[PDB]
């Protein structure tokens, strides 16, 4: 969907000989809070011996972008399950928001490797601060001084089902 970003802070259940258990925090990209807390318990059950009925959610908050109108370059580390095995990938996305870069990455994985949502882990999202630290040429070709390009062959949609002159694709 159109994703949001949440921090989820959870904890075990306090008991005898373990009072005040340690708190653990995650950042989940999800479209609502129910899916956010479900993904939290998925990852915490894979990393520790805690169940959803063994622990409790302490806090759920939504994180906005600090500067939503500033074009940034993001490096994303992911791992995924193909039909044969599982692999790690690194990719680069030039966009204005982390949730926007995550949406474009999910569309790119579906288009290029036929990987669905249930078989993708976002390991890390980070911003690449300097140029000459950009590895991908498809991102590098937009970081050139005084960038200009045209848009040939403009196609315009219409109504009325009939036209009375031949169209023109000039621009």
């Amino acid at each position: 969907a159109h994703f949001k970003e949440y921090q989820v802070i959870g904890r075990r259940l306090p008991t005898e000989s373990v009072p005040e258990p340690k708190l653990f925090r995650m950042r989940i990209f999800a479209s609502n809070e129910v899916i956010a807390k479900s993904r939290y318990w998925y990852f915490l059950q894979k990393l520790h011996k805690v169940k959803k009925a063994s622990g409790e959610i302490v806090s759920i908050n939504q994180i906005n972008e600090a500067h939503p109108t500033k074009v940034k370059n993001f490096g994303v580390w992911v791992r995924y399950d193909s039909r044969s095995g599982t692999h790690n990938m690194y990719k680069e996305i030039r966009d204005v928001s982390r949730v926007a870069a995550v949406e474009t990455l999910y569309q790119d994985m579906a288009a290029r490797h036929r990987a669905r949502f249930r078989s993708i882990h976002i390991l890390k999202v980070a911003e690449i601060e300097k140029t000459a630290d950009v590895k991908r040429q498809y991102v590098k070709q937009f970081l050139t001084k005084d960038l200009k390009f045209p848009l040939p062959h403009r196609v315009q949609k219409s109504t009325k089902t009939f036209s009375y002159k031949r169209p023109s694709t000039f621009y």
Binding site: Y90, K124, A132, V134, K135
Partner: peptide
């Protein structure tokens, strides 16, 4: 090097 992006070892080790 100057006109080169760094290595994956460098990025993951600084990570």
């Amino acid at each position: 090097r100057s006109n080169r992006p760094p290595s994956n070892r460098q990025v993951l080790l600084q990570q």
